[PDB]
Each structure stands twice: as C-alpha cells, then as structure tokens.
Design an enzyme around this catalytic site. Structure first.
Site, PDB file in Angstrom:
ATOM      1  N   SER B 133       0.847  -1.182   0.000  1.00 57.61           N
ATOM      2  CA  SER B 133       0.000   0.000   0.000  1.00 57.61           C
ATOM      3  C   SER B 133       0.886   1.237   0.000  1.00 57.61           C
ATOM      4  O   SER B 133       1.750   1.388   0.869  1.00 57.61           O
ATOM      5  CB  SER B 133      -0.930   0.010   1.212  1.00 57.61           C
ATOM      6  OG  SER B 133      -0.251   0.472   2.366  1.00 57.61           O
ATOM      7  N   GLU B 247       8.453 -12.974 -20.516  1.00 58.67           N
ATOM      8  CA  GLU B 247       7.883 -12.159 -21.588  1.00 58.67           C
ATOM      9  C   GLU B 247       6.880 -11.149 -21.041  1.00 58.67           C
ATOM     10  O   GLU B 247       5.781 -10.975 -21.562  1.00 58.67           O
ATOM     11  CB  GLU B 247       7.236 -13.053 -22.639  1.00 58.67           C
ATOM     12  CG  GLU B 247       8.124 -14.175 -23.145  1.00 58.67           C
ATOM     13  CD  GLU B 247       7.961 -15.452 -22.345  1.00 58.67           C
ATOM     14  OE1 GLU B 247       7.692 -15.359 -21.132  1.00 58.67           O
ATOM     15  OE2 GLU B 247       8.099 -16.547 -22.930  1.00 58.67           O
TER      16      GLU B 247
END
Ligand SMILES: Nc1nc2c(ncn2[C@@H]2O[C@H](COP(=O)(O)OP(=O)(O)OP(=O)(O)O)[C@@H](O)[C@H]2O)c(=O)[nH]1
Ligand SMILES: Nc1nc2c(ncn2[C@@H]2O[C@H](COP(=O)(O)OP(=O)(O)O)[C@@H](O)[C@H]2O)c(=O)[nH]1
Ligand SMILES: [Mg+2]
Lengths: 57, 432, 430, 280, 100
Positions: B133, B247
């Site tokens: 957070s 990827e």
C-alpha cells in the site's frame, strides 16, 4: 423520619438518584446485545456472503 | 521446477495476500490445514514438506500485530510457517520517514534473512511478486527499503509490483500525497513491472456489473486474487500458448524508464444473469477494452497504446482470439502509437477460472485478463503532483518528517524526477 | 503492547477518570472485584493496554490518582468500582490548594511532585513498549491546573518521544464557580502549548446544552456529563484495542490532524445521541450518523464551528460497516461545505473503521476536528483576564508566593500570539 | 411552540411539558427493574439468601453424664464476653488460601452458623470415645454450611499477615489439612496443670483451648468489629499471662520447681465454655 | 500387576509439569494461561473439574502424561475421593506450594 432502607434503593433506582444507570442513556425492546464480529473472523472462514453482513436486522 | 516468491507488506498487502492465498489453496485443492485430501502443478506456490502439508512461498510484514495475529488465530493457523509472519512493535502512523529510515532498519534484516532461507530451498526461482500500500507509512516505507535491498542482493531476478495508489476523490488519509510521491521515486529505478490498483476504479465496476450497492474491501481483494491467478496460471496449467513472466519485461516496456501499466478484467457477471448471456470470446474481448472496465481510474482515450498483453483461459480458440483482435484493430476509438506496428502478446491456458464459494462472481467457461501500457498514466501523476505542491508550498506537515531524522532536501528531487517522467511520457507520444 | 498510562488530578479529573474506568470495565467485561467474566476471547488479547496483571486472577488498572485534598479520592474509594485501583496509587496532601495556581504549582506542588513522578516512572518501565499518556484535569481549578501541569512539564522533560494527550475542561463565562478562574486558566494554558502533543477542550455549558436539547432530560447532574466524556474517550482508542478493517492509532491521528506544531488544539463530539423517547424510532445508518456528526450544536465545545473554517477532521467509525458509504458521505459533506473547509489542502478528513460496536449500540462514531473556531474561548478568557488584571484585583494572593506580574504578562502575550497566528490561517489564501 | 422547563413544574401525571420524556424514562426504569428480576442478580434477593441459610435451624447433640465425646455438635462460649463463637463465610480473609474469619456473638440462641463439630484428627492411644485432657483434636463446621469440610486454624505471627483489629496472632476457618488444625484442652487452676493430664473433660465447666504448633491460648478481646449481622467482637490466640515476673531460673538452679508446671497466672479472657444440649 | 506408581516418580512428574509452565511467557503470567483454558471449556461454569478434562488440559499444554501416571497424580491430589477436583485447589497446589 422512618425512611425505611428499601425505599432508598427504590428511589435511587427510579426517583432520580444522582447518577445514571449503566450507560442506558446512550442505549440505541431490550438492549444489552454485546455484539462482536470482524471481517476476517467470519468472511474468510465461516464463508458468509459479503452482502449478508451489516444488514441491520 | 519454476517457483515465484510472494511479498506482502502493509495492511493492504496483507489483506490482499490473504484472499489471493485463499483462492490459491482452493484452486489447488489444498485444505486450510495444509494437507491434500488425496482422493506437480502446485510447485509454483507450495513446497512439499517431505511427508505432510504444503507450506506457501510467501512472507508477511507489518509493524502492528493487529492484522498478523488475526491470521494466527484464524482457520489458517496450521498453514503458514510460524516465523515468517513478521510482526513489529510500533505502527508507522502514515509516515514515510519511520518506515524507511528509523524503524525499518532492524526489521528489514530479518526479512532479508527469511527471504534468503526461503529462496535457498527453491531451485528454479523465476521472479518476485510484491503487494504493498503506497498511501500508508509502513507500506511505502519497507516496500521501498526491501526493493532497494533486493535490487543489490539478487539483481537480475525480475520483480513485479501491484501497488495501490490513492484515488482522485476517494481518499482516507490527508498526508498520503507526501509519502505517495517518494515511493514512486524509490520504485522507478528498481521495479521492473508496476500495476495500478486504485480503489475507486474497482468501486464503480462493482455497481455497474455485480449490482453491489454496499461493497467492502472483501470484494476488492477477491477481484485482485482473480487477476493474479489469471496472470500466473500459465506457469502451472497447460495451454496452447504458455507465457512466462520473462515475456513481461520483454514485451511490455519499450524503455527502461517506462514501466507503469494498468489492467482490466472481464467478464464480471453475477450468478443470476449468467445463464442469459452469450459470453462468447468476441464479447468478453470487447468488454476488456471498454474504458469504464479498467482496473485503474484512468481514461485511455487521452493517450496512445504502446503494448498490450492479454491472457486467455478456458476453452478459447485461436480463431476467436484472432477474430476479435482484427476487429479491435479495425475499430477507430482505440489507437496505437506509430512506432509500434504490432502490439499484442496473447497467451492461451486450458484451465477454466476457479470460482470461490461465497463470492459474487459466477462460474464461467472463459475469461480474459490483459495488461496495457499506455501514455494516459501521466494524467494520474499530473493530478498527484498538483495536490502535492498545492500544500507543499506552505510547508505544511513537513515538521513531522524532518523531526524524525529526514532531510528536507529529499522532496526536491522527488518533485523533479516525477516531472521528468511526465515529460518523458509526453515526449514518447509525439509522432515521427 | 503499546499500552497507555492514565493520569488524573483534581476533582474534575478524578470524576472523569472514575467514569472512564467504569465504562472501559463494562466494555471489557471486568467485575467490580477485578475478575474477568466476559463471553468473548476478543476482550483478552488486548487487555494489557489498559489493565495490568497481578496474582489472584485479577486485573488492575494502571491509573494514578493525585490531588492535594483527600476528600475526592476518599469518596471515590468507597464509591462503586472503587476497589479496582491499587491503594498505593493514591497520593494525597493534607493542606489543599485553595484554588490558587501559585500554591498548586510552586509551594506544595514542588514538594509533592516527587511521589507522583516516582509512581509514573515505575509504571513507565513496568511496560515493555510504552505508547503515550492521557490526562484529565481542570484548568479553572487551583490544584489540578497547577500541579498536573507541573507533572506535564516534568514528564515531557523525561520522555521526549512518547505522546501525551490532554482532555482539559476550561472555565466558561456563562457559569462562574470561582472569581479567579481567568488567572490560573491563562497561567495553565501558557504551559500546554509547548508540551501537550494533543489538547482536547470540553465545556460544561456545551454538555448542558447537549443534555437539554438532544437527551431532553429534565434533571441533569454531573454524572451524565461524566458518562458523555467517558464515551468520547473510549471512542478514541477503539481501533487500537479492537481489530478492524482500517486501524489508526494516536500517532497516526496526530500526524494526520496536526499541520503545524502550535495548532494542537482540537474539538470533539460523539454520535449518535437521542432522547429516550425516539430511541427506537430512527434508523441508525451511515448518512444519518454522518449528518448528525457535523451538527454545529452537537459539539463538546461552546465555540460555534460555522464561524470558522475546518483545517483537518477525523472520524473513528465503529461497528460492522462498508467503506463505500463512509467515504462517499465524507466526500459529499466536504464538497457541500466547501465554504467551511480550508482550500489549500485536499481531502482534509480522515476515516477509520473498528468492527466492535459499543455496548447497547450497533453503529457509533467519534469525531475529532481542528478548526479556527476554537479561538473564541481564548478571546473571551483573555478579555476577562485583561479586565480583571488592569485593576490588579486579587493579585496579592498570587504574588505572596514569589509570583511576579511579568510572567503573567508573558502568558497573556503568548496567548495573544497564538490567537493571532491561529486566526491568520482562516484568512490565509494560496 | 410548546416549551419545557417553564419555572415551577408539577409531576409527570400532568401535561405541562416534557411529560413524555420523563414518563418514558420512568417506564424504562421499571423495565430495567424487571430485567434485574429476570436474571438472579437483584441486590435485594442476595440478602435474603444469606439471611435464610445462615439463620437455619439445627438440633444440638445431648451430652450424657456431662461428658463430651467425638462426633458431637456442641456450642463454644467465652465466659468473659458471655457470648458464643460464630463463623462468617461471606467475609474472606486476605490470603492466597481461601480462609474465613470468625467472631464471637452475644446472642446464645443456637443457629447453624454457631453450630460446630469436633473430630479425631489422628489416632491416639485412648480408644474410648471420651476425650481426655491434652488430647489433640480438630474443629469442623456443620456440613450444611459448606459442602467442603472446614477447620479452624491459625498461622504464625508475621508483620505481613496479622489480625485486622487485634494486630496479634489471628485465627481463621481454612480448608488446610495440616497440623495447624490440632487443638488441645486445658484447665484453669494453675496448681492442677500437670495432674489433670489424661483425665476426662466435662461439659458445663470452664476450660482452656491451646494450639499445638504455637502454644497460644485462644481468647477474645473488647475490640469493635462489624459484619452483615450487626456488631460483634473478634477472637484470636494470645497468652494473657500475668505481668509480674518470677525468678524462675533461680528455682530450677536451686532445684525447687520444674519447667512443666507454670508459675504465672492468666486472666479470664482466655477462659472458654463448652455448652451442650439441655434436653435429650 | 506390573508395578504401582511410587511417590518418587510422582514427585518427578509434578516437578516436570511445574517447570514447564515457568518457561512460558513471564513470571506473573501462566496463572491466567491456566485459567483461560478452564474458562474456554467449563460450559456448566460450576468450577468442578473432571479426570477426562485433565488429560485434555495437559494435552493442550504440551504434556502428554501417561494414563497410569495421570491417575496417580489425580488420585494423590484429591482427598474427597469423588473423582472431581476443584480448579482453584489444583492451581494452588501446582503454583503456590512451598514444597515440591
Ligand atoms: N483496496 C484496498 N485498499 C486497502 C485495503 N487496506 C488498506 N488499503 C489502502 O491502504 C491505505 C491506508 O494505509 P494502510 O494500508 O491501511 O496502512 P499501511 O500501508 O500498513 O501504513 P500504516 O498505516 O502506517 O501502517 C488506504 O488508503 C487504502 O487505500 C484493502 O483491504 N483493500
Ligand atoms: N464535567 C465536570 N465538571 C466539573 C466536575 N466537578 C467540578 N467541575 C467543574 O470544575 C469547576 C471547579 O473546578 P475545581 O473543583 O476548583 O478544580 P480542582 O480544584 O482542580 O479540583 C466548576 O466550575 C465545575 O463546573 C465534574 O465532575 N464534571
Ligand atoms: Mg497500516
């Protein structure tokens, strides 16, 4: 003056003793209902529908 | 043989990791106590004990015992390792200086040792997954510190960040603009992949799709769990086109300074309207690209598209995938950048989505999750910088930072680097 | 674990502390004999915050009762819930103060401060991880306003990092119990601006208005005011004592509500309050609670809040709830009252959620706010002080113990400086 | 525009103003009283419970030929106060072990609280049931007062633990099974100390009670003490010997007296009485 | 019969249990630790404790006592011979006892 003992607690409980009775001024047919439950305490284990909580009734 | 390590810091990180790990154990059929009913597609998240349960490859961090011990008291007490739920002594109290300079120093070393011990067991480590957070003290504090330590400790191992930035008007704290800026500077040079996970953008999705008028954080976390599972299912389930986390830092970030992307998820339907909807590949693909369906409060119509990777799970067909892509390219309101003629990386997984009982999502045979790199993210930085400077001009709340041991001049470079990033995004969007 | 110690002085401090301890004991299911007889395990894992642990299966509060006259403490010892406190924490004098700041701060306070300092220090290293302090006293009285503030100065000297919070009841011109209240009020408030990290004001007239207008009870005493103050207190640390969705502690509140070091004076309020007639006739819900929270007449301070502008505000929600409606109500009220909120700061209101509703309630909210409307009481007390000091009335009692008029002048000058630099931000524009 | 608190006010029966609020408040007070009646926690109901069970009836065991024997229920009376001893279970002494205080009560009417039993602490050579002088025994409470058997014991003098009022060696009713429960009977006349050993003890005559581990004689003194049942006086163990000293070491050095025979008198505060049933 | 439990090994057992409590948490503690378990399962809230609970109680605090040894210490502790042991008396014997 007689002022029998029982009358004393009777009046301090009903006829304005110089106190207030156990937070009942802040109350809300009968309200004690010590109610407790957190999000993780029930949602993740008891598997309660996320809309079903709150829901005042 | 391929494993990932999950990091959960801050209250938001803990409360999203709880839901994600619940969904992981339910999907893999592991009981809450940790043992399979028994009545090698789980190594990515759980490690065998030789004889008995499965223990997750996750670590929890927080400087308050409130969220940590509740998990210790919950039904999952036998699942997590007792000593990898690190609990602190004092709350950071929404202050960046404490979580990064004073109290995180003696806790980060223990976390580093625990991560060392966890990674030594693994033999084919793939990358890292951090949930934090930003608008919180210890969330931005340690997360920055842990990223700094990791980038020099391990180095080439990729790391992916799912951060929760404050919403434009949906907000809780007042000093959140301060520590939000610094965490961006800390992660800019050290996080390979960043994903936006603001709260308002999910709030509207609930009302529009699931017809939920009284939502809470539980609905928030479960959707993010679905996103993570759809992202990582390629590692652990078979499919026509398998896509590794390799990827991602190879097909989505044209330049090293440009790695801020945002996601969307479809379909999002309830249990009552599921049987009356076609729910074909064409419809779900179109729903993903709808501007209102984005997981981040940002409109893509104000910017171009750089690279999009979408992963399909279920019984999808290459014909259906290619047909929707052609229509998307043909249709006009979505536009790409000139120097990127091809901008889609598609992965196919055969496993249908797993639905958790007690949730709002219904059982569906197909789903799509996509990650998009665009130039519209500069808008959320623009509104954040404006809010920052508008109250930094009077030097309000600064004494809370400098008096704890923080240099005043730190805010100077935090401002200029963000402006440099904004103008980088602006310059990339110009045509040749 | 991050436990807090309690300090109270004077008659007002003793009564507030007694009522607060009664309320917290009721919340935690503590018997008058100190034995736990609750039904949940959620009342035990954080019991160390407010109660120490002893032999015999009993819990004891970490509270200190300090005063120059033994009457109030002797009465509260015999009163209900009077056996919880250890007799060793009862410290008293045999002379009193006579409602004089000089007597309370220099003559007997100096010689009596040693015992209270020793007990607070031993309690401080009693706990492994201290969190802070909380004080109750009266600035209009002698013994409290002097000796409690002296203890404040000493403890701030000793512990610079720990927090300290004050719940100070200040004199009001509408009802005057003593003819020399402005003197010791100014002298005391001179010493809080540099020491108290948090200051929360309470007005007896404001509480009386609450009782006459919301509770609508014909015969009030000090007991119901004490209960209201105790509920306001217990609402503050609910998130610290109980689990929830968004926990916020004292220092989070401080850093989120204090823009500048000399602006640590707050206003408080509590919701929902209703008359006993319509208790079951209204719906307890997020919009109703948030609408009644920001009522001008619901505040605990006699100052009118719509004559100034809010700097920052905080809401501590209790009970099982949902974040959407809470934050939407916050945003809606902030947008609708844009004239009453300072423009050079965005989203200046904080919301926190605790999942344990109080006794006899399903939803409850504690509201703490910082606004430029607090200065009205300072203006009025300063005007009364100047009027009563220009004639040097009743000054010989104070100056007979070494006090000099120059320190009074410094106190009033600092009050004026604080008032000016506090009201200038109301007219300050970006 | 109906306004409240308009100067003088009547009771809630009239409709002058704010009558509904006080009537509703008055109504709920009785309802709370009803709830306190629903659950057994009324302050009133507690005091009759202690009234009835303490003031219960009991039959006192009759003594034949004025000789006491084991298993009897007898009265214990101090002649100095002309009052009988009693035990207050509701009052708890300040100690880790659960022990209850004992006080002497002026009224001589036989009650369960003041009814006591004596029993053989451990086997002695005297097989006969008649008690002889200087024979160890333990006092026991009537089984109806408490299901657990309770005994009368007294622990050594300490600055930490002492009597609340007398400040001397204190006595209490405790569940201890130790030697502290042992007591022995003792005569009045200083000359007949050593002779009466092994002689039967009779009822109706004065007698002394002595603790074995401490050799302290149980007694009572005129010090005010209060409990639920009015005002009473305390009991304890103390040696109330005469103040004037005697050159006793000279006696043994010359060879005139012996240690066993005591040379000092005591006052009547230590004297006690055993009272049995009047009718068989 | 193979053997009867002797006071020597009874003392050994009671010493083993008594030391195990001390290690946990702090010195002023462990009495509430013992009490909270009895509060957890004494549903009839009468204060009377049974032999089957003893086995369950000791199972919780990492002391699997043998049934023969558990019977011996249980029998030695109580003199009522009713098969029921008071909880506060058990706490007193285990904690506040000058002699082993
Ligand atoms: N979506 C979502 N956001 C959360 C959740 N919990 C906390 N947050 C975010 O966290 C912010 C507040 O900071 P927290 O995470 O609660 O606390 P922290 O990050 O540990 O920092 P500290 O408060 O100093 O301990 C809020 O603005 C939320 O945006 C959650 O369950 N779901
Ligand atoms: N709220 C509240 N105010 C009180 C109480 N007792 C006294 N006061 C107020 O305190 C003022 C007098 O303070 P004082 O007793 O002289 O302070 P002290 O000498 O430090 O105890 C009066 O104006 C009262 O209105 C109480 O129990 N509650
Ligand atoms: Mg936090």
């Amino acid at each position: 003056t007689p002022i029998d003992k029982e009358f004393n607690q009777h009046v301090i409980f009903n006829t304005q003793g110089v106190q207030q009775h156990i937070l009942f001024g802040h109350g809300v047919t009968d309200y004690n209902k010590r109610e407790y439950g957190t999000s993780y305490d029930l949602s993740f284990n008891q598997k309660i529908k996320p809309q079903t909580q709150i829901y005042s009734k | 043989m391929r494993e990932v390590i999950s990091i959960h810091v801050g209250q938001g990180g803990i409360q999203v990791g709880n839901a994600c790990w619940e969904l992981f154990c339910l999907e893999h059929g592991i009981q809450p106590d940790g043992q399979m009913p028994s009545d090698d597609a789980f190594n990515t998240f759980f490690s065998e004990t030789g004889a008995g349960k499965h223990v997750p490859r996750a670590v929890f961090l927080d400087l308050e015992p409130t969220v940590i011990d509740e998990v210790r008291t919950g039904t999952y007490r036998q699942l997590f390792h007792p000593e990898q739920l690190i609990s602190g002594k004092e709350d950071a109290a929404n202050n960046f200086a404490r979580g990064h300079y004073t109290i995180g120093k003696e806790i980060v070393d223990l976390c580093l040792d625990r991560i060392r011990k966890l990674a030594d067991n693994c033999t084919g480590l793939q990358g890292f997954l951090v949930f934090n957070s930003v608008g919180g003290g210890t969330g931005s504090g340690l997360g920055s510190l842990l990223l700094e330590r990791l980038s020099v400790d391990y180095g080439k191992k990729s790391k992916l960040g799912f951060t929760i930035y404050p919403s434009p008007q949906v907000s809780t704290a007042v000093v959140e603009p301060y520590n939000s800026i610094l965490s961006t500077h800390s992660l800019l040079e050290h996080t390979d992949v960043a994903v936006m996970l603001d709260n308002e953008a999910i709030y509207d999705i609930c009302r529009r799709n699931l017809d939920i008028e009284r939502p809470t954080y539980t609905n928030l976390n479960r959707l993010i769990a679905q996103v993570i599972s759809s992202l990582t299912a390629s590692l652990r389930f078979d499919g026509a086109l398998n896509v590794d986390i390799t990827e991602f830092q190879t097909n989505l970030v044209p330049y090293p300074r440009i790695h801020f992307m945002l996601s969307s998820y479809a379909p999002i339907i309830s249990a009552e309207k599921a049987y009356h909807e076609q729910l074909s590949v064409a419809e779900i693909t179109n729903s993903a690209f709808e501007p209102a369906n984005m997981m981040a409060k940002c409109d893509p119509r104000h910017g171009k598209y750089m690279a999009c990777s979408m992963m399909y799970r279920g019984d999808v067909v290459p014909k259906d995938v290619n047909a929707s892509i052609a229509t998307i390219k043909t249709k006009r309101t979505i536009q790409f950048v000139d120097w990127c003629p091809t901008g889609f990386k598609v992965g196919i997984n055969y496993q249908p989505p797993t639905v958790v009982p007690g949730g709002d999502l219904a059982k569906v045979m197909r789903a799509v999750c996509m990650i998009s790199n665009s130039t519209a993210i500069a808008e959320v930085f623009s509104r954040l910088d404006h809010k920052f400077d508008l109250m930094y001009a009077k030097r309000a709340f600064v004494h809370w930072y400098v008096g704890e041991g923080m240099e005043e001049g730190e805010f100077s470079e935090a401002r200029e680097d963000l402006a440099a990033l904004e103008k980088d995004y602006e310059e990339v969007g110009i045509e040749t | 674990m991050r436990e807090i110690v309690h300090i109270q002085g004077g008659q007002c401090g003793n009564q507030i502390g007694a009522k607060f301890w009664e309320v917290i004991s009721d919340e935690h299911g503590i018997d008058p004999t100190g034995t736990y007889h609750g039904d949940s395990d959620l009342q035990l894992e954080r019991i160390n915050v407010y109660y120490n642990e002893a032999t015999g299966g009993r819990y004891v509060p970490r509270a200190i009762l300090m005063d120059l006259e033994p009457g109030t403490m002797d009465s509260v010892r015999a009163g209900p819930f009077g056996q919880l406190f250890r007799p060793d924490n009862f410290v008293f004098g045999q002379t009193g103060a006579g409602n004089n700041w000089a007597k309370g701060h220099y003559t007997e306070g100096a010689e009596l401060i040693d015992s209270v300092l020793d007990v607070v220090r031993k309690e401080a290293e009693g706990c492994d991880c201290l969190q802070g302090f909380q004080i109750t006293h009266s600035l209009g009285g002698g013994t409290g306003s002097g000796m409690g503030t002296l203890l404040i100065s000493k403890v701030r000297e000793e512990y610079p990092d720990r927090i300290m919070e004050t719940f100070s009841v200040v004199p009001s011109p509408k009802v005057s119990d003593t003819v020399v209240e402005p003197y010791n009020a100014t002298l005391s408030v001179h010493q809080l601006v540099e020491n108290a990290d948090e200051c929360m004001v309470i007005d007896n007239e404001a509480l009386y208005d609450i009782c006459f207008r919301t509770l609508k009870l014909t015969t009030p005493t000090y007991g119901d005011l004490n209960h209201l103050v105790s509920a306001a207190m217990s609402g503050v640390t609910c998130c610290l004592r109980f689990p929830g969705q968004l926990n916020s502690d004292l220092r989070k509140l401080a850093v989120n509500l204090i823009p500048f070091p000399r602006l640590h004076f707050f206003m408080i309020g509590f919701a929902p309050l209703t008359s006993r007639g319509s208790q079951q006739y209204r719906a307890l819900t997020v919009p109703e609670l948030t609408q009644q929270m920001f009522d001008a007449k619901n505040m605990m301070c006699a100052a009118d809040p719509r004559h100034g502008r809010y700097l920052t505000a905080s809401a501590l929600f209790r009970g099982r709830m949902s974040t959407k409606e809470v934050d939407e109500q916050m945003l809606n009220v902030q947008n609708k009252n844009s004239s009453y909120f300072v423009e050079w700061i965005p989203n200046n209101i904080k919301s926190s959620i605790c999942d344990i509703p109080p006794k006899g309630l399903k939803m409850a909210v504690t509201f703490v706010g910082n606004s430029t409307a607090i200065q009205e009481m300072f203006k009025r007390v300063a005007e009364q002080f100047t009027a009563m000091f220009r004639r040097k009335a009743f000054l010989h009692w104070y100056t007979g113990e070494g006090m000099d008029e120059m320190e009074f002048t410094e106190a009033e000058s600092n009050m004026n400086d604080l008032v000016s630099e506090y009201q200038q931000y109301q007219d300050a524009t970006a | 525009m109906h306004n409240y608190n308009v100067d003088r006010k009547y009771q809630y029966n009239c409709r002058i103003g704010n009558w509904s609020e006080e009537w509703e408040l008055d109504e709920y007070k009785m309802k709370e009283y009803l709830k306190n009646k629903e659950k057994q926690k009324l302050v009133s109901t507690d005091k009759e419970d202690r009234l009835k069970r303490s003031l219960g009836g009991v039959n006192l065991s009759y003594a034949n030929e004025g000789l006491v024997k084991f298993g009897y229920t007898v009265m214990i009376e101090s002649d100095f106060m002309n009052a009988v001893v009693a035990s207050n279970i509701w009052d708890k002494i300040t100690g880790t072990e659960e022990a209850y205080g004992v006080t002497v009560t002026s009224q001589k009417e036989p009650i369960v609280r003041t009814a006591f039993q004596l029993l053989r602490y451990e086997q002695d050579q005297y097989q006969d049931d008649v008690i002889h002088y200087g024979q160890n025994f333990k006092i026991a409470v009537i089984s109806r007062l408490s299901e657990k058997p309770l005994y009368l014991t007294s622990s050594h003098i300490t600055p930490q633990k002492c009597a609340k009022f007398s400040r001397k060696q204190e006595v209490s009713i405790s569940t201890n099974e130790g030697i502290n429960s042992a007591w022995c009977f003792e005569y009045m006349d200083p000359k007949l100390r050593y002779e009466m050993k092994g002689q039967p003890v009779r009822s109706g005559e004065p007698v002394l009670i002595k603790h074995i581990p401490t050799c302290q004689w149980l007694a009572t003194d005129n010090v005010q003490y209060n409990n639920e049942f009015g005002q009473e006086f305390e009991v304890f163990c103390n040696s109330y010997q005469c103040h004037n000293k005697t050159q006793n070491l000279i006696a043994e050095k010359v060879g005139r007296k012996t240690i066993e025979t005591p040379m000092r008198n005591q006052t009547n505060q230590n004297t006690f009485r055993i009272v049995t049933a009047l009718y068989p | 019969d193979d053997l009867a439990i002797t006071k020597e090994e009874v003392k050994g057992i009671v010493k083993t249990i008594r030391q195990k409590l001390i290690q946990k948490t702090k010195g002023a503690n462990d009495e509430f630790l013992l009490r909270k378990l009895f509060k957890e399962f004494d549903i009839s809230n009468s204060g009377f404790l049974t032999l089957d609970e003893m086995n369950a109680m000791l199972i919780k605090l990492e002391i699997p006592i043998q049934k023969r040894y558990l019977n011996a210490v249980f029998s030695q502790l109580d003199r009522n011979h009713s098969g029921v042991i008071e909880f506060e008396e058990f706490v007193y014997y285990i904690v506040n006892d000058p002699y082993p």
